[PDB]
């Protein structure tokens, strides 16, 4: 059963469509005939259009609002089958040329949406008296139902397909379903077919690049939610459309919005913030430098040679995570924050400067930086730092702009306790506290590989011993809310799916 969502393109790309999971935007010859079940709209915009089998419209979209069967300005349009438009209202309006349609009612074609049932220009339905309305009401809607209310796997009508995951009280765990069935359109498919990727709701979509990401955790690509921002390669300054760009200019800053792995080299230079004239660039507004904060690789050379002075850190690049220097500015300098006025080198996450040597020079008021042992960061042995002419180390030490002693010997890229290379005691994420809340504390953590991992909030704190050993409510030592078998849980399962989607009573 073929599928679809200019006249030639549409008449070629809907012609075999046995079912359209989208909508029927037939606008402005006899090209469609077996459009069996439509889960959506039908934008009928024109005099002889058979559409003979067009059975169900689900109104999953609407032209304006519950505008399911939009008509405008077709006596030989025998929609004899269109017997129950579901979850929509019939905007069967502007029917000037329509014949035999006024004689037929337009309301048995809809259910409980007659409020928005507008129509303006026993009884036979379409052209030719050989067709009739064939009332069946005054779960089938198309007359083992022919067309289901919600889901019809092969022939049975179901509201919901067998879930991809079915709880296992035998495992005391909410398991996968060995009979897992992703709901392809309205048909359950053991495999999400049609090169479609499983989606969050279980309905595979051929595109879930919105607020998510595509992964392949099995033989079928799956659409996963976007962790922070999801990867979105952008060409940087030097390679790609900006191949002649000479800075993260104003006219070129935005197209780097959400640009995850800048593939070129971000190269913020004095002309940019000054704003260039023989290149026609407006001045880069200091706030707009926030746009790049999603950068998590600058797989090139980041030469950041001036940042707004009213800002006291290079925070806008506070998410660089690898500065792999496949291109190196001046062949050796890979992170080159040079001649700025950053108080702290501030770049809190640079954890692999892969190739080139790193020069942090001229930052005349960058004082915490010299403490960092730039041996763990750099990525090949030919690297050599050149941290020169920062603030005088004696001057910084005397003035007390020192790394928070809640941070280990490795140094710390900025005065605040969050920006600290390695922790004196454990770490609670970006910060590194004096002691993870082993007994005393609200989050009541559980230390992990010298890191605080907040307990599963589903487990009550206990005041005599540590809260919970390991992540996940299975590993928590106190469970004030209900605990499901040998695991804690939010609540006991009642509306679960079992051997035949049985609502597992489980226990009280």
């Amino acid at each position, epitope marked *: 059963k073929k599928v679809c969502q200019h006249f030639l393109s549409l008449q070629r790309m809907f012609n075999n469509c046995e079912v359209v999971l989208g909508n029927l935007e037939i606008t402005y010859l006899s090209f469609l005939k077996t459009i069996q079940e439509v889960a959506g709209y039908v934008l009928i915009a024109l005099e002889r259009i058979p559409l003979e089998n067009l059975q169900i419209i689900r109104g999953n979209m609407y032209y304006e609002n519950s505008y399911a069967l939009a008509v405008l300005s077709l006596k030989e349009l025998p929609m004899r089958n269109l017997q129950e438009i579901l979850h929509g209202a019939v905007r069967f309006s502007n029917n000037p040329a329509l014949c035999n349609v006024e004689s037929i009612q337009w309301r048995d074609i809809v259910s409980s949406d007659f409020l928005s049932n507008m129509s303006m220009d026993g009884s036979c339905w379409g052209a030719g008296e050989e067709n009739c309305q064939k009332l069946t009401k005054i779960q089938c809607a198309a007359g083992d139902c022919l067309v289901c209310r919600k889901f019809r796997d092969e022939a049975t009508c179901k509201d919901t397909c067998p879930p991809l995951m079915l709880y296992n009280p035998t495992t005391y765990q909410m398991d996968v379903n060995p009979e897992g069935k992703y709901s392809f359109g309205a048909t359950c498919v053991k495999k999400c077919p049609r090169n479609y990727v499983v989606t969050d709701h279980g309905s595979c979509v051929r595109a879930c690049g919105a607020d998510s990401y595509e992964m392949e955790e099995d033989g079928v690509r799956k659409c996963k939610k976007c962790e922070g921002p999801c990867r979105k390669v952008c060409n940087g300054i030097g390679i790609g459309e900006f191949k002649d760009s*000479l800075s993260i200019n104003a006219t070129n800053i935005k197209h780097f919005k959400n640009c995850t792995s800048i593939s070129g080299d971000l190269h913020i230079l*004095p002309v940019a913030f000054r*704003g260039d*004239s*023989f290149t*026609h660039t407006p001045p880069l507004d200091p706030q707009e430098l926030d746009i790049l904060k999603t950068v998590k690789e600058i797989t090139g050379f980041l030469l950041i040679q001036a940042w707004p002075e009213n800002r006291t850190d290079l925070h806008a690049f506070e998410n660089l995570e690898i500065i792999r220097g496949r291109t190196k500015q001046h062949g050796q300098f890979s992170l080159a924050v040079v001649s700025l006025n950053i108080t702290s080198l501030g770049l809190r996450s640079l954890k692999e400067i892969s190739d080139g040597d790193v020069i942090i020079s001229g930052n005349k008021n960058l004082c915490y930086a010299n403490t960092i042992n730039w041996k763990k960061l750099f990525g090949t042995s030919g690297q050599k730092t050149k941290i020169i002419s920062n603030r005088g180390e004696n001057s910084c030490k005397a003035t007390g702009q020192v790394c928070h002693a809640l941070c280990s010997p490795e140094g710390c890229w900025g005065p605040e306790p969050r920006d600290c290379v390695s922790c004196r005691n454990v770490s609670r994420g970006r910060e590194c506290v004096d002691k993870c809340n082993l007994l005393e504390g609200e989050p009541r953590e559980f230390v992990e590989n010298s890191e605080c991992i907040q307990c599963h909030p589903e487990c009550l704190p206990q005041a005599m011993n540590i809260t919970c050993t390991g992540r996940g409510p299975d590993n928590c030592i106190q469970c004030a809310h209900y605990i499901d078998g040998p695991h804690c849980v939010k609540t006991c399962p009642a509306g679960v799916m079992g051997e035949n989607n049985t609502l597992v009573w489980k226990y009280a």
Partner: single-chain antibody, 232 residues
Framework: GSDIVMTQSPLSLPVTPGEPASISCRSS???????????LEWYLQKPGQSPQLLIY???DRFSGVPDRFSGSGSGTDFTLKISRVEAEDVGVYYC?????????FGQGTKVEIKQVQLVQSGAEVKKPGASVKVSCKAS????????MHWVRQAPGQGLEWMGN????????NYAEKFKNRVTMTRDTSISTAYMELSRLRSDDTAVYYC???????????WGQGTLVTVSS
């Protein structure tokens, strides 16, 4: 089409002191770039001196450019009203273009009467087809932080950009009328910018003012200029 013929309304208009002289220029297209900034400018050249920028965009003024001069315009016609004029403003007001891809300076309506210093190289005279390397030393600004765009001034004609050079990376963006005769290289270390014009022709005799392409105004602060009169 390629150029933007920014013709200037009066020509050699002589102005008595203390009079509201008005020199207008009209642009062969509408000079309003897609950024929407109308980057006109009216760079005023006092006798025997470097071109010095006077109105930054259509209606700002240069810091240190007195408010005596002022300007207005839109679309394809713009003009500047010099409400009170003294000895100082005497000189020719040559309207640059800006949106037009090749910068294109105007013919020149010479008004008469009815720190960072870019050091240039010295006066040279050659013979046809020879080569000139007229240099510009840079002092006072981070040399690799301001594009040393390099105008030229054919005597008895208007200024016309010849080609830039972003001293940071040696990039040139040489102009069309000289696309295959001029080579402008960089030497960041010594803070000098050369501009090797090859195969000089009879009419290349010019003063190659080597100015600095500013932030909000093309050609901000300019150099001495190395006159190179060539006639074999």
């Amino acid at each position: 089409g390629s150029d933007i013929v920014m013709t200037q309304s009066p020509l050699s208009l002589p102005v008595t002191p203390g009079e509201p002289a008005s020199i207008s220029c009209r642009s062969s297209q509408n000079i309003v770039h897609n950024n929407g900034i109308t980057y006109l400018e009216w760079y005023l050249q006092k006798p025997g001196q470097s071109p010095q920028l006077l109105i930054y965009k259509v209606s700002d003024r240069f810091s240190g450019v007195p408010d005596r001069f002022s300007g207005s315009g839109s679309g394809t016609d713009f003009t500047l009203k010099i409400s009170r004029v003294e000895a100082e403003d005497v000189g020719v007001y040559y309207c640059f273009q800006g949106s037009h891809i090749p910068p294109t300076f105007g013919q020149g309506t010479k008004v008469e009467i009815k720190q960072v210093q870019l050091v240039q190289s010295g006066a040279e005279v050659k013979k046809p087809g020879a080569s000139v390397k007229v240099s510009c030393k840079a002092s006072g600004y981070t040399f690799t932080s301001y594009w040393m765009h390099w105008v030229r001034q054919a005597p008895g004609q208007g200024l016309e950009w010849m080609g830039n050079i972003w001293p940071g990376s040696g990039g040139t963006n040489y102009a069309e009328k000289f696309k295959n005769r001029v080579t402008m290289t960089r030497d960041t270390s010594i803070s000098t910018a050369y501009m090797e014009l090859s195969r000089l022709r009879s009419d290349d005799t010019a003063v190659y003012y080597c100015a600095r392409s500013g932030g909000p105004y093309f050609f901000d602060y300019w150099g001495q200029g190395t006159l190179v009169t060539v006639s074999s």
